[PDB]
Structure formats: structure tokens, C-alpha cells
Design a protein around this ligand. Structure first.
Ligand SMILES: [Mg+2]
Ligand SMILES: [Mg+2]
Ligand SMILES: [Mg+2]
Length: 221
């Protein structure tokens, strides 16, 4: 399976009690790579329950797969996001402390020359090179989220990566307070993923983000 060097970064921020963001980098039986990021909310402070509900489901479902070829990826992401939305909605309805909770979800199935992205909400996926930064997803924003209705309609995107250097998935705690050009200029410099991720996180904290800040940085070879 195709996989990029990638790392997951999260921080509650200085202005939040809890971290209601979630995410991860998961590998299936043939080492294909799945990037996941979720921004939860709602319920009786149950936002972390919703975002980690979806992240855990995607992890278990993906690790159960042997091979998802690129021509199957759109359908796999769409059907599983729909089923997870169904399960999360009813999990929340059955628990008065959770009722009303929901979460965004942006995720990406990695392939050799492309990535397949599914999105629900206002978390984002970007591609960045030395000269441009393109937001692949469109914010669904009040925000459309998973878990609040028995129906959900995720957007699917296929993006060739050949002429880019970084793939970025992030919660709105980053891009509400850091401009796209600030992100690009930070990434066009030399450095590893860890250091690029730490300066990007410290940059979000320096702009005094009042939200949970979470992102995945993936290097495109
Ligand atoms: Mg949130
Ligand atoms: Mg937002
Ligand atoms: Mg947020």
C-alpha cells in the first residue's frame, strides 16, 4: 500500500477545558494509509465522544480491509461515513448525556499519485507547494456535521499530488486564526515533519487560537 510520511498534531489550546478534536493515521492489512481528522461538539460536553466515535470506527473498519484500490475508494469512504453517521446518531439519541453531539470529519485515502478525500463539516484538506496553497474541500457552513441526523451527504474529492509538497488536514482551530499564506510560507522552508508541525502549532498558539487545534501533515515525495 501507498503511504506518505505523516504525523498527527493536536492541542487543546489555552482557552478550552477539553480537547474535542480527534484523529489518527491508520494502516490496513496491506499497509495502505488512511488519514482521519474530526472536530466534535455538542451534547453535555460530549464533543470528544463524537469525534473519537468516528475516528475509532474508521480505524476498525479500515484495519479490517485487505485492499481498497483507488477505483473503489470513493464508494468505500461514502458508504462507511454514511454507516458511521447512522450509528453515531442513534448512539447519541440513546444516551441523554450525548444527545445532540456531533463531529466534523475530513479523511483521506492515500494512493501512489493521488489521494481520495471525503469531507463533512468545516475541517479542511489542503495541498501546498512553493507557489500555491489550495483548499480541496468546501466548508459545510451553522455547520453540517455527522451524528445530528440519520442522513448525511459527504463530499468526495480526488486530488493528484504530483506537483505538490504537502498534504494538510486540519480542524478550524488552525485556519480560523492562521491565514493560508501564513501556512504556505511556513511550509516552503526546509525542515522535517515534526519541526514543521511544531512551528505550525506554536504559530496557531501565538495567534491565540480560542479553539482546539489539530492537524495532520503529510509529506509528498
Ligand atoms: Mg469542536
Ligand atoms: Mg468553524
Ligand atoms: Mg473547532
Amino acid at each position: 500500500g501507498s503511504h506518505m510520511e505523516a504525523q498527527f498534531f493536536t492541542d487543546t489550546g489555552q482557552h478550552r477545558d477539553k480537547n474535542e478534536d480527534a484523529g489518527g493515521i491508520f494502516y490496513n492489512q496491506t499497509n495502505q494509509q488512511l488519514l482521519v481528522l474530526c472536530d466534535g461538539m455538542g451534547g453535555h460536553k460530549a464533543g470528544e465522544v463524537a469525534s473519537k466515535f468516528v475516528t475509532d470506527e474508521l480505524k476498525s473498519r479500515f484495519e479490517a480491509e485487505n485492499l481498497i484500490e483507488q477505483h473503489q475508494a470513493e464508494n468505500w469512504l461514502r458508504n462507511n461515513i454514511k454507516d458511521i453517521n447512522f450509528q453515531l446518531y442513534h448512539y447519541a439519541q440513546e444516551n441523554a448525556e450525548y444527545k445532540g453531539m456531533g463531529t466534523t470529519c475530513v479523511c483521506a485515502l492515500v494512493f501512489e499519485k493521488s489521494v481520495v478525500i471525503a469531507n463533512v463539516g468545516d475541517s479542511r484538506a489542503y495541498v501546498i507547494n512553493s507557489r500555491q496553497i489550495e483548499q480541496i474541500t468546501s466548508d459545510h457552513s451553522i455547520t453540517k456535521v455527522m451524528g445530528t441526523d440519520k442522513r448525511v451527504s459527504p463530499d468526495l474529492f480526488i486530488k493528484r499530488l504530483n506537483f505538490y509538497d504537502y498534504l494538510l488536514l486540519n480542524s478550524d482551530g488552525l485556519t480560523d486564526y492562521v491565514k493560508d499564506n501564513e501556512i504556505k510560507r511556513l511550509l516552503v522552508k526546509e525542515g522535517t515533519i515534526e519541526d514543521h508541525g511544531d512551528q505550525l502549532m506554536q504559530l496557531a498558539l501565538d495567534n491565540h487560537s480560542k479553539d482546539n487545534v489539530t492537524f495532520i501533515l503529510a509529506a509528498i515525495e
